[PDB]
Symmetry: C2
Subunit: 122 residues, 2 copies
């Protein structure tokens, strides 16, 4: 019976992305080969099975640096990080395989399924 | 030209609320008279002009406790905190004034405007 604010969640996410852009309250650096990306652990956990599994463990909860698998493409990771914070996925025929493999590694099942649909439709 | 995931933002918010429910990565306690509420500063900043103005200031960025104005009703605050994390506002004729006044204090203009519409429609 509560009143629904249909833009609230999108507004929240946009504002979280603004905070990331200003490095406000970011609490982890994700290192991917020669590149690094700062983020909020909460958003990573909300969007990725890998990050959820890492930070839910009290043993790893306070890590400030995560080194991703050396074989992960920083491009693929960047695309997915921007998706996490925007709901918009930049899939193209020139990056689909990198994005899909990265999404498998990050355990983002719905994104992987969408990548498969992209392949089917191309 | 990016692919839009129309449920992603809502899913993120739901997951953030799940993290709050488990006290995972919460980083502030909001004290409101005799009650206390834990939350994520990022979500508070995303949803409230008061919290945004507080935590954007490097002087207050690292506060772990915020004591709200003693005149603020903990009920009104609780209702609004749950709105922040759910997009659903529990307005009723028995709580409208408390919620509205609290939303004014928290600088949640759209919620205040909605409270005014509620009054107009009642
Ligand atoms: C409810 O059963 C779960 C929960 C979690 C996992 C991990 N696998 C996974 N996780 C994903 C996605 C997409 C985002 N997430 C993160 C997420 O759901 N986070 C979250 C969940 C519950 N409460 C708070 C939070 Cl932050 C994904 O495709 N697979 C699971 O794997 C089988 C099952
Ligand atoms: C863009 O101009 C602004 C930004 C902020 C304020 C503070 N007044 C206010 N803030 C509100 C609501 C509802 C949620 N918020 C928080 C918010 O917008 N947070 C945010 C903004 C930009 N980047 C990152 C973040 Cl976290 C509200 O009704 N009034 C402003 O007041 C005039 C103007």
């Amino acid at each position: 019976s509560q009143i629904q604010f249909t833009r609230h969640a999108s507004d929240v996410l946009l504002n979280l992305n603004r905070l990331r852009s200003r490095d406000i309250l970011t609490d982890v650096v994700i290192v991917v080969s020669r590149e690094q990306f700062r983020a909020h652990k909460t958003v990573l956990m909300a969007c990725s099975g890998l990050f959820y599994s890492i930070f839910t463990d009290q043993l790893k909860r306070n890590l400030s640096v995560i080194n991703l698998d050396p074989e992960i493409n920083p491009e693929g990771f960047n695309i997915l990080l921007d998706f996490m914070y925007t709901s918009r996925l930049n899939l193209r025929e020139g990056n689909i395989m990198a994005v899909m493999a990265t999404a498998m590694y990050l355990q983002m099942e719905h994104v992987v399924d969408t990548c498969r649909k992209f392949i089917k439709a191309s």
